[PDB]
Amino acid sequence: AIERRHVAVLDSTMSYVETGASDGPTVLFLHGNPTSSYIWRNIIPHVAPLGRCIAPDLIGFGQSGKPDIDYRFFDHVRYLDAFIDALGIQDVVLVAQDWGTALAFHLAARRPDRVRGLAFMEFIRPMPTWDDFHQRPQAREMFKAFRTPGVGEKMILEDNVFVEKVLPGSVLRTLSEEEMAVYRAPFPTPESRKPVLRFPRELPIEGEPADVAAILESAHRALAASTYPKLLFAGDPGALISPQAAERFAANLKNCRLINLGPGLHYLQEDHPDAIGRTIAGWLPEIA
């Protein structure tokens, strides 16, 4: 009982995977850069017996449409909101990673009524300095380059380094040639890679861009006050989130359980699908 579908959204379409009607909650899975619903493929089967799983491809990613837009964070907000409306999704449990977490936090800040729980990992937070981005200095230098005009275009649009090198580089196991062919499929041309280049330029680092920084600071205030149940997964060493930062974050949030998965980098779904899926499955009955 699983299907890839498409739905008209604003000026385009979005693709999504759906497991269909369930007596349990609706569970909305949100990927980040430069992945798609595909990253949840080994996790969703653990959750499907307990809830209706919906995993969209963000606009410009996966099998979603490629409209002529900027692909800013605010564009993703609008397309995801319209996706939610088009499917009639109401109460939801959010499962999110990377930019999917920023979308989840901003959704919960505006519509707290609807958010019944949040399982998250490797999340976006305002970063006052570059030392607050990532944990390895060579990664900081690379993302500084992505954020530099001209240089980032060459690296991401022309050479496709985010898909071809950064993605497999932040998985401990080796992604197979067939897995990489799926991950590369949305991005055959420099033009198609525009969303992949815009995302790192949206990261709120040193207060810039100021519009994203302010919106995510507000979303984090709402998250800190919120009372819905939460699961925070973390790897060692992780990438955006160190083990120490994850422990402090989960300790300070309300109703938040920390799951230390063990050795892992950024794309934790690729190294720990059973642990993530089984843990979410065991936690959903607390929500219902």
Can 98 be counted among the known catalytic residues? Answer: yes
Spatial CB neighbours of 187, under 8 Å, sequence gap ≥ 6: 34, 160, 163, 193, 196
Cα dihedral 145, 68, 60, 90 sign: positive
* Residue 235 CB-density burial (10 A; 0-12 exposed, 13-18 middle, 19+ buried): buried
Rg (alpha carbons) of the chain, rounded to whole number: 17
Q: How far apart (Å, rounded) are the C-alpha atoms in residues 273 and 158?
A: 32
Ordered structural domains, the chain, with CATH: 3-286 (3.40.50.1820)
Q: How far apart (Å, rounded) are the C-alpha atoms in residues 105 and 125?
A: 10
- Whether residue 203 contacts residue 133, with contact meaning beta carbons closer than 8 Å, is answered with yes
Spatial CB neighbours of 266, under 8 Å, sequence gap ≥ 6: 98, 122, 170, 171, 238, 239, 240
Spatial CB neighbours of 24, under 8 Å, sequence gap ≥ 6: 50, 51, 52, 284, 288
What's the distance, CA 79 to chain centroid? 15
Spatial CB neighbours of 120, under 8 Å, sequence gap ≥ 6: 94, 95, 96, 97, 101, 104, 230, 231, 232, 233
- Whether residue 107 contacts residue 94, with contact meaning beta carbons closer than 8 Å, is answered with yes
Residues composing the chain: 288
Can 122 be counted among the known catalytic residues? Answer: yes
Catalytic residue among 18, 57, 75, 122: 122
Catalytic residue among 31, 106, 220, 266: 266
Angle at 152 between CA 151 and CA 153, to 5 degrees: 90
DSSP string, the chain: --EEEEEEETTEEEEEEE----SS-EEEEE--TT--GGGGTTTHHHHTTTSEEEEEPPTTSTTS---SS---HHHHHHHHHHHHHHHT--SEEEEEEEHHHHHHHHHHHH-GGGEEEEEEEEE---BSSGGGS-S-HHHHHHHHHHTSTTHHIIIIIIS-HIIIIIHHHT-SSPPPHHHHHHHHTT--STGGGHHHHHHHHHS-BTTBSHHHHHHHHHHHHHHHH--S-EEEEEEEE-SSS-HHHHHHHHHHSSSEEEEEEEEE-S-HHHH-HHHHHHHHHHHHHHH-
Catalytic residue among 57, 75, 98, 270: 98
- Which pair of structure tokens corresponds to residue 143? 């993302």
